[PDB]
Structure 1
Protein backbone atom coordinates (compact mmCIF):
# COMPACT_ATOMS: atom_id res chain seq x y z
CA UNK A 1 0.00 0.00 0.00
CA UNK A 2 1.11 3.54 -0.84
CA UNK A 3 0.17 4.48 2.73
CA UNK A 4 2.33 1.88 4.48
CA UNK A 5 4.23 4.72 6.19
CA UNK A 6 1.02 6.48 7.29
CA UNK A 7 -0.44 5.88 10.74
CA UNK A 8 -4.07 6.99 10.97
CA UNK A 9 -3.80 7.23 14.77
CA UNK A 10 -1.40 10.13 14.29
CA UNK A 11 -2.93 11.47 11.11
CA UNK A 12 -6.27 11.99 12.85
CA UNK A 13 -4.47 14.08 15.49
CA UNK A 14 -2.64 15.99 12.76
CA UNK A 15 -5.68 17.09 10.76
CA UNK A 16 -7.62 18.12 13.87
CA UNK A 17 -4.71 20.09 15.32
CA UNK A 18 -5.32 23.84 15.59
CA UNK A 19 -2.13 24.27 13.55
CA UNK A 20 -3.42 22.26 10.56
CA UNK A 21 -3.16 25.22 8.22
CA UNK A 22 -6.70 25.73 6.92
CA UNK A 23 -7.73 28.96 8.66
CA UNK A 24 -9.98 29.52 11.68
CA UNK A 25 -13.19 27.61 12.42
CA UNK A 26 -16.28 29.80 11.95
CA UNK A 27 -18.20 29.07 15.17
CA UNK A 28 -17.22 32.50 16.48
CA UNK A 29 -19.57 34.09 13.92
CA UNK A 30 -22.79 33.95 15.94
CA UNK A 31 -21.31 34.59 19.40
CA UNK A 32 -20.46 38.31 19.51
CA UNK A 33 -24.15 39.17 19.69
CA UNK A 34 -24.81 36.88 22.66
CA UNK A 35 -22.05 38.63 24.60
CA UNK A 36 -23.06 42.19 23.71
CA UNK A 37 -26.65 41.47 24.74
CA UNK A 38 -25.52 40.22 28.16
CA UNK A 39 -26.84 36.77 27.27
CA UNK A 40 -23.51 35.00 27.83
CA UNK A 41 -21.85 36.58 30.88
CA UNK A 42 -20.27 33.75 32.92
CA UNK A 43 -19.32 30.08 33.00
CA UNK A 44 -22.89 28.90 33.61
CA UNK A 45 -24.48 30.86 30.74
CA UNK A 46 -21.56 30.05 28.42
CA UNK A 47 -22.15 26.32 29.08
CA UNK A 48 -25.87 26.65 28.37
CA UNK A 49 -25.17 28.55 25.14
CA UNK A 50 -22.68 25.88 24.08
CA UNK A 51 -25.00 22.99 24.88
CA UNK A 52 -27.82 24.63 22.94
CA UNK A 53 -25.62 25.37 19.93
CA UNK A 54 -24.05 21.92 19.92
CA UNK A 55 -27.46 20.25 19.89
CA UNK A 56 -28.97 22.47 17.20
CA UNK A 57 -27.35 23.63 13.97
CA UNK A 58 -23.99 22.12 14.86
CA UNK A 59 -25.66 18.73 15.18
CA UNK A 60 -28.23 18.83 12.35
CA UNK A 61 -25.88 20.47 9.86
CA UNK A 62 -22.22 19.98 10.74
CA UNK A 63 -21.99 16.64 12.57
CA UNK A 64 -24.74 15.05 10.52
CA UNK A 65 -23.16 16.21 7.25
CA UNK A 66 -19.88 14.53 8.28
CA UNK A 67 -21.69 11.28 8.98
CA UNK A 68 -23.61 11.48 5.68
CA UNK A 69 -20.58 12.06 3.44
CA UNK A 70 -18.57 9.43 5.33
CA UNK A 71 -21.33 6.88 4.70
CA UNK A 72 -21.76 7.88 1.06
CA UNK A 73 -18.00 7.72 0.48
CA UNK A 74 -17.97 4.12 1.73
CA UNK A 75 -20.67 3.43 -0.89
CA UNK A 76 -18.66 5.41 -3.47
CA UNK A 77 -21.68 7.64 -4.05
CA UNK A 78 -20.31 11.00 -5.12
CA UNK A 79 -23.73 12.15 -6.32
CA UNK A 80 -25.13 11.90 -2.81
CA UNK A 81 -22.11 13.74 -1.37
CA UNK A 82 -22.54 16.61 -3.79
CA UNK A 83 -26.25 16.51 -2.92
CA UNK A 84 -25.51 16.99 0.78
CA UNK A 85 -23.16 19.87 0.04
CA UNK A 86 -25.86 21.43 -2.16
CA UNK A 87 -28.46 21.25 0.65
CA UNK A 88 -26.02 22.89 3.08
CA UNK A 89 -25.03 25.65 0.65
CA UNK A 90 -28.70 26.42 -0.08
CA UNK A 91 -29.52 26.56 3.65
CA UNK A 92 -26.64 28.63 5.02
CA UNK A 93 -27.05 32.31 5.96
CA UNK A 94 -25.64 34.87 5.82
CA UNK A 95 -23.62 34.96 2.59
CA UNK A 96 -20.45 35.89 4.49
CA UNK A 97 -20.70 32.72 6.60
CA UNK A 98 -21.33 30.61 3.51
CA UNK A 99 -18.21 32.00 1.81
CA UNK A 100 -16.13 31.43 4.97
CA UNK A 101 -17.36 27.85 5.20
CA UNK A 102 -16.60 27.19 1.53
CA UNK A 103 -13.12 28.65 1.98
CA UNK A 104 -12.49 26.40 4.98
CA UNK A 105 -13.62 23.28 3.11
CA UNK A 106 -11.47 24.12 0.10
CA UNK A 107 -8.44 24.73 2.32
CA UNK A 108 -8.93 21.41 4.12
CA UNK A 109 -8.89 19.55 0.80
CA UNK A 110 -5.92 21.51 -0.58
CA UNK A 111 -3.93 21.00 2.62
CA UNK A 112 -4.42 17.25 2.41
CA UNK A 113 -3.48 17.25 -1.27
CA UNK A 114 -0.28 19.21 -0.64
CA UNK A 115 0.97 16.25 1.41
CA UNK A 116 2.09 14.35 -1.69
CA UNK A 117 3.21 11.31 0.31
CA UNK A 118 -0.38 10.72 1.45
CA UNK A 119 -2.52 8.78 -1.04
CA UNK A 120 -6.18 9.75 -0.53
CA UNK A 121 -7.38 7.21 -3.10
CA UNK A 122 -9.29 7.61 -6.37
CA UNK A 123 -12.69 8.31 -4.81
CA UNK A 124 -11.32 11.21 -2.78
CA UNK A 125 -9.43 12.46 -5.85
CA UNK A 126 -12.71 12.51 -7.79
CA UNK A 127 -14.53 14.20 -4.93
CA UNK A 128 -11.86 16.91 -4.89
CA UNK A 129 -12.19 17.39 -8.65
CA UNK A 130 -15.98 17.75 -8.53
CA UNK A 131 -16.84 19.49 -5.28
CA UNK A 132 -18.34 22.97 -5.70
CA UNK A 133 -19.35 23.83 -2.15
CA UNK A 134 -17.10 21.83 0.18
CA UNK A 135 -17.20 22.37 3.93
CA UNK A 136 -14.77 21.27 6.58
CA UNK A 137 -17.19 18.65 7.94
CA UNK A 138 -18.22 17.16 4.58
CA UNK A 139 -14.68 16.98 3.21
CA UNK A 140 -13.46 15.50 6.51
CA UNK A 141 -16.18 12.86 6.25
CA UNK A 142 -14.91 11.81 2.82
CA UNK A 143 -11.31 11.96 4.07
CA UNK A 144 -12.01 9.71 7.06
CA UNK A 145 -13.93 7.16 5.05
CA UNK A 146 -11.21 7.15 2.37
CA UNK A 147 -8.50 6.22 4.85
CA UNK A 148 -10.60 3.69 6.75
CA UNK A 149 -10.81 5.67 9.96
CA UNK A 150 -13.68 4.41 12.14
CA UNK A 151 -16.68 6.76 12.09
CA UNK A 152 -17.16 7.16 15.82
CA UNK A 153 -13.45 7.93 16.27
CA UNK A 154 -13.53 10.41 13.39
CA UNK A 155 -16.55 12.13 14.94
CA UNK A 156 -15.00 12.27 18.44
CA UNK A 157 -11.82 14.01 17.29
CA UNK A 158 -13.70 16.45 15.07
CA UNK A 159 -16.26 17.26 17.77
CA UNK A 160 -13.58 17.87 20.38
CA UNK A 161 -11.55 20.15 18.09
CA UNK A 162 -14.58 22.22 17.11
CA UNK A 163 -15.76 22.54 20.71
CA UNK A 164 -12.32 23.47 22.03
CA UNK A 165 -12.39 26.30 19.52
CA UNK A 166 -15.91 27.35 20.66
CA UNK A 167 -14.93 27.29 24.33
CA UNK A 168 -11.73 29.29 23.86
CA UNK A 169 -13.77 31.86 21.92
CA UNK A 170 -16.00 32.23 25.02
CA UNK A 171 -12.96 32.36 27.26
CA UNK A 172 -11.48 35.23 25.26
CA UNK A 173 -14.70 37.07 24.45
CA UNK A 174 -16.81 37.00 27.61
CA UNK A 175 -14.13 36.84 29.01
CA UNK A 176 -13.78 33.88 31.35
CA UNK A 177 -10.83 32.55 33.31
CA UNK A 178 -8.81 29.72 31.76
CA UNK A 179 -9.97 27.54 34.64
CA UNK A 180 -13.59 28.19 33.70
CA UNK A 181 -12.78 27.11 30.13
CA UNK A 182 -11.42 23.77 31.36
CA UNK A 183 -14.43 23.21 33.66
CA UNK A 184 -16.71 23.80 30.66
CA UNK A 185 -14.84 21.31 28.47
CA UNK A 186 -14.97 18.71 31.23
CA UNK A 187 -18.69 19.37 31.72
CA UNK A 188 -19.25 18.81 28.00
CA UNK A 189 -17.93 15.21 27.93
CA UNK A 190 -21.27 13.54 28.68
CA UNK A 191 -23.10 15.83 26.24
CA UNK A 192 -20.38 14.95 23.67
CA UNK A 193 -21.28 11.28 23.92
CA UNK A 194 -25.02 12.06 23.68
CA UNK A 195 -24.34 14.14 20.56
CA UNK A 196 -22.40 11.37 18.84
CA UNK A 197 -25.07 8.79 19.66
CA UNK A 198 -27.76 11.13 18.31
CA UNK A 199 -25.72 11.86 15.16
CA UNK A 200 -25.65 8.12 14.43
CA UNK A 201 -29.47 8.03 14.63
CA UNK A 202 -30.06 10.82 12.09
CA UNK A 203 -30.16 10.71 8.27
CA UNK A 204 -30.56 12.90 5.17
CA UNK A 205 -34.15 13.73 6.15
CA UNK A 206 -32.81 15.57 9.20
CA UNK A 207 -30.09 17.52 7.39
CA UNK A 208 -30.29 21.27 8.08
CA UNK A 209 -33.59 20.91 9.98
CA UNK A 210 -32.38 22.93 12.95
Structure 2
Protein backbone atom coordinates (compact mmCIF):
# COMPACT_ATOMS: atom_id res chain seq x y z
CA UNK A 1 0.00 0.00 0.00
CA UNK A 2 2.96 2.27 0.70
CA UNK A 3 4.68 0.19 -1.99
CA UNK A 4 5.84 3.36 -3.75
CA UNK A 5 7.09 4.86 -0.47
CA UNK A 6 10.69 4.35 0.66
CA UNK A 7 11.30 4.92 4.37
CA UNK A 8 15.00 5.52 3.72
CA UNK A 9 14.08 8.65 1.79
CA UNK A 10 11.02 9.55 3.85
CA UNK A 11 13.13 9.86 7.02
CA UNK A 12 15.38 12.35 5.22
CA UNK A 13 12.41 14.31 3.84
CA UNK A 14 10.52 14.85 7.14
CA UNK A 15 13.73 15.85 8.98
CA UNK A 16 14.77 18.29 6.24
CA UNK A 17 14.90 21.90 7.48
CA UNK A 18 12.57 22.67 4.57
CA UNK A 19 9.77 20.34 5.71
CA UNK A 20 6.98 22.98 6.03
CA UNK A 21 5.77 23.06 9.63
CA UNK A 22 5.85 26.78 10.42
CA UNK A 23 8.34 28.56 12.71
CA UNK A 24 10.75 26.94 15.23
CA UNK A 25 11.27 27.02 19.02
CA UNK A 26 14.86 25.97 19.92
CA UNK A 27 16.29 29.51 19.81
CA UNK A 28 14.49 30.22 23.09
CA UNK A 29 17.07 30.08 25.89
CA UNK A 30 19.85 31.18 23.54
CA UNK A 31 18.92 34.81 22.89
CA UNK A 32 18.74 35.32 26.65
CA UNK A 33 22.21 33.89 27.24
CA UNK A 34 23.53 36.12 24.46
CA UNK A 35 22.17 39.26 26.12
CA UNK A 36 23.62 38.07 29.45
CA UNK A 37 27.04 37.76 27.75
CA UNK A 38 27.01 34.06 28.72
CA UNK A 39 27.16 32.84 25.10
CA UNK A 40 29.31 35.10 22.90
CA UNK A 41 31.77 32.75 21.17
CA UNK A 42 32.30 29.21 19.87
CA UNK A 43 33.50 27.77 23.16
CA UNK A 44 30.60 29.14 25.21
CA UNK A 45 28.06 28.17 22.55
CA UNK A 46 29.32 24.58 22.68
CA UNK A 47 28.99 24.32 26.46
CA UNK A 48 25.50 25.79 26.20
CA UNK A 49 24.61 23.21 23.53
CA UNK A 50 25.95 20.26 25.54
CA UNK A 51 24.15 21.42 28.68
CA UNK A 52 20.85 21.80 26.83
CA UNK A 53 21.15 18.51 24.96
CA UNK A 54 21.58 16.57 28.20
CA UNK A 55 18.91 18.39 30.20
CA UNK A 56 15.46 19.30 28.85
CA UNK A 57 16.12 18.08 25.30
CA UNK A 58 16.97 14.58 26.53
CA UNK A 59 14.54 14.28 29.42
CA UNK A 60 11.58 15.88 27.62
CA UNK A 61 11.96 15.71 23.81
CA UNK A 62 14.10 12.63 23.16
CA UNK A 63 12.52 10.58 25.95
CA UNK A 64 9.02 11.53 24.82
CA UNK A 65 9.88 10.52 21.24
CA UNK A 66 10.80 7.06 22.51
CA UNK A 67 7.75 6.76 24.78
CA UNK A 68 5.23 7.52 22.03
CA UNK A 69 7.10 5.26 19.61
CA UNK A 70 6.98 2.33 22.03
CA UNK A 71 3.34 2.98 22.92
CA UNK A 72 2.35 3.23 19.27
CA UNK A 73 3.82 -0.23 18.71
CA UNK A 74 1.35 -1.40 21.36
CA UNK A 75 -1.50 0.68 19.94
CA UNK A 76 -1.65 2.43 23.31
CA UNK A 77 -3.16 5.82 22.46
CA UNK A 78 -4.00 6.42 26.13
CA UNK A 79 -0.36 6.43 27.20
CA UNK A 80 0.53 8.68 24.25
CA UNK A 81 -2.07 11.28 25.29
CA UNK A 82 -0.84 10.99 28.87
CA UNK A 83 2.74 11.68 27.84
CA UNK A 84 1.49 14.72 25.93
CA UNK A 85 -0.43 15.90 29.00
CA UNK A 86 2.67 15.64 31.19
CA UNK A 87 4.74 17.60 28.69
CA UNK A 88 2.11 20.30 28.27
CA UNK A 89 1.92 20.80 32.05
CA UNK A 90 5.71 21.07 32.36
CA UNK A 91 5.99 23.67 29.60
CA UNK A 92 6.11 27.43 30.18
CA UNK A 93 5.46 30.17 29.37
CA UNK A 94 2.25 30.07 27.35
CA UNK A 95 4.10 31.35 24.26
CA UNK A 96 6.37 28.30 24.17
CA UNK A 97 3.45 26.02 25.00
CA UNK A 98 1.48 27.58 22.14
CA UNK A 99 4.36 27.37 19.67
CA UNK A 100 5.26 23.75 20.52
CA UNK A 101 1.59 22.86 20.06
CA UNK A 102 1.55 24.67 16.73
CA UNK A 103 4.68 22.82 15.64
CA UNK A 104 3.13 19.50 16.65
CA UNK A 105 -0.09 20.24 14.79
CA UNK A 106 1.81 21.36 11.68
CA UNK A 107 3.92 18.20 11.58
CA UNK A 108 0.76 16.07 11.55
CA UNK A 109 -0.99 18.30 9.03
CA UNK A 110 1.97 18.28 6.66
CA UNK A 111 2.01 14.46 6.64
CA UNK A 112 -1.75 14.39 6.06
CA UNK A 113 -1.59 16.82 3.14
CA UNK A 114 0.50 14.17 1.33
CA UNK A 115 -2.52 12.20 0.12
CA UNK A 116 -0.40 9.47 -1.50
CA UNK A 117 1.17 8.59 1.84
CA UNK A 118 -0.86 6.18 3.99
CA UNK A 119 -0.12 6.66 7.70
CA UNK A 120 -2.31 3.77 8.82
CA UNK A 121 -5.35 3.63 11.08
CA UNK A 122 -3.46 4.05 14.33
CA UNK A 123 -1.72 7.26 13.31
CA UNK A 124 -4.93 8.76 11.96
CA UNK A 125 -6.70 7.99 15.23
CA UNK A 126 -3.84 9.65 17.12
CA UNK A 127 -4.12 12.68 14.84
CA UNK A 128 -7.83 12.98 15.60
CA UNK A 129 -7.58 12.82 19.39
CA UNK A 130 -4.33 14.63 20.21
CA UNK A 131 -4.80 17.87 22.14
CA UNK A 132 -1.24 18.88 22.82
CA UNK A 133 0.86 17.24 20.09
CA UNK A 134 4.54 18.13 19.93
CA UNK A 135 7.06 17.67 17.15
CA UNK A 136 8.87 14.88 19.03
CA UNK A 137 5.77 12.98 20.14
CA UNK A 138 3.93 13.04 16.81
CA UNK A 139 7.24 12.02 15.17
CA UNK A 140 7.51 9.06 17.51
CA UNK A 141 4.06 7.93 16.42
CA UNK A 142 4.92 8.59 12.77
CA UNK A 143 8.06 6.41 12.90
CA UNK A 144 6.36 3.56 14.74
CA UNK A 145 3.47 3.56 12.27
CA UNK A 146 5.74 3.17 9.23
CA UNK A 147 8.09 0.66 10.88
CA UNK A 148 11.16 2.90 11.00
CA UNK A 149 13.77 1.52 13.43
CA UNK A 150 13.84 3.42 16.76
CA UNK A 151 17.58 4.09 16.99
CA UNK A 152 17.48 5.39 13.43
CA UNK A 153 14.43 7.61 14.01
CA UNK A 154 16.17 9.05 17.10
CA UNK A 155 19.51 9.61 15.39
CA UNK A 156 17.90 11.51 12.50
CA UNK A 157 15.69 13.63 14.76
CA UNK A 158 18.58 14.38 17.12
CA UNK A 159 20.86 15.55 14.31
CA UNK A 160 18.18 17.76 12.73
CA UNK A 161 17.22 19.57 15.92
CA UNK A 162 20.86 20.09 16.86
CA UNK A 163 21.68 21.44 13.40
CA UNK A 164 18.88 23.97 13.88
CA UNK A 165 20.33 24.98 17.26
CA UNK A 166 23.79 25.46 15.80
CA UNK A 167 22.66 27.50 12.81
CA UNK A 168 20.80 29.58 15.41
CA UNK A 169 24.07 30.16 17.26
CA UNK A 170 25.92 30.99 14.01
CA UNK A 171 23.40 33.70 13.14
CA UNK A 172 22.80 35.10 16.63
CA UNK A 173 26.19 35.13 18.37
CA UNK A 174 27.38 35.26 15.66
CA UNK A 175 29.82 32.45 14.93
CA UNK A 176 31.69 31.53 11.75
CA UNK A 177 30.27 28.84 9.47
CA UNK A 178 33.35 26.73 10.16
CA UNK A 179 32.84 27.22 13.90
CA UNK A 180 29.36 25.74 13.52
CA UNK A 181 30.80 22.78 11.65
CA UNK A 182 33.49 22.19 14.27
CA UNK A 183 30.76 22.26 16.90
CA UNK A 184 28.59 19.72 15.08
CA UNK A 185 31.60 17.44 14.78
CA UNK A 186 32.52 17.67 18.47
CA UNK A 187 28.90 16.88 19.41
CA UNK A 188 28.88 13.48 17.71
CA UNK A 189 30.20 11.64 20.78
CA UNK A 190 27.70 13.39 23.04
CA UNK A 191 25.06 12.39 20.44
CA UNK A 192 25.64 8.69 20.94
CA UNK A 193 25.73 9.06 24.72
CA UNK A 194 22.42 10.91 24.50
CA UNK A 195 20.94 8.11 22.38
CA UNK A 196 22.25 5.43 24.78
CA UNK A 197 20.77 7.27 27.75
CA UNK A 198 17.43 7.76 25.99
CA UNK A 199 17.09 3.98 25.67
CA UNK A 200 17.74 3.41 29.40
CA UNK A 201 15.23 6.02 30.57
CA UNK A 202 11.56 5.32 31.31
CA UNK A 203 8.42 7.42 31.74
CA UNK A 204 9.32 8.16 35.37
CA UNK A 205 12.13 10.34 34.01
CA UNK A 206 9.81 12.32 31.73
CA UNK A 207 10.20 16.08 32.21
CA UNK A 208 12.45 15.76 35.26
CA UNK A 209 15.20 17.93 33.76
TM-score (norm. length: structure 2): 0.99
**1:118-166 deviations in Å (ceiling 9; x for gaps):** 0000000100010000000000000000000000000000000000000
**1:5-25 deviations in Å (ceiling 9; x for gaps):** 000000000000011000233
Secondary structure of the 1:40 match is: coil
TM-superposed CA distance for 1:105, in Å, is 0.2
Secondary structure of the 1:149 match is: coil
Give the stretch that moved more between structures: 24-33 or 139-148: 24-33
**1:77-106 deviations in Å (ceiling 9; x for gaps):** 000000000000011011100000000000
Match of 1:25 in 2: 24
Give the stretch that moved more between structures: 72-81 or 28-37: 28-37
Secondary structure of the 1:25 match is: coil
Structure 1: how far apart are the matches of 2:158 and 2:179? Answer: 20
Contact kept? 1:25, 1:162, Cα under 8 Å: no
Structure 2: how far apart are the matches of 1:23 and 1:137? Answer: 15
Structure 2: segments with no counterpart, 5+ residues:
none
Structure 1: how far apart are the matches of 2:172 and 2:110? Answer: 29
Structure 1: how far apart are the matches of 2:43 and 2:27? Answer: 18
Structure 2: how far apart are the matches of 1:24 and 1:54? Answer: 20
Contact kept? 1:102, 1:135, Cα under 8 Å: yes
Contact kept? 1:85, 1:134, Cα under 8 Å: yes
Contact kept? 1:124, 1:146, Cα under 8 Å: yes
Instruction: Tell me how large the CA RMSD over aligned residues is.
Output: 0.5
Structure 2: how far apart are the matches of 1:169 and 1:23? Answer: 16
Contact kept? 1:66, 1:141, Cα under 8 Å: yes
Q: What does 1:66-81 correspond to in 2, within 5 Å?
A: 66-81=65-80
Structure 1: how far apart are the matches of 2:118 and 2:155? Answer: 23
Match of 2:152 in 1: 153
Structure 1: segments with no counterpart, 5+ residues:
none
TM-score (norm. length: structure 1): 0.99
Secondary structure of the 1:116 match is: coil
Give the stretch that moved more between structures: 22-31 or 164-173: 22-31
Secondary structure of the 2:4 match is: coil
Contact kept? 1:167, 1:185, Cα under 8 Å: yes
Give the stretch that moved more between structures: 122-131 or 24-33: 24-33
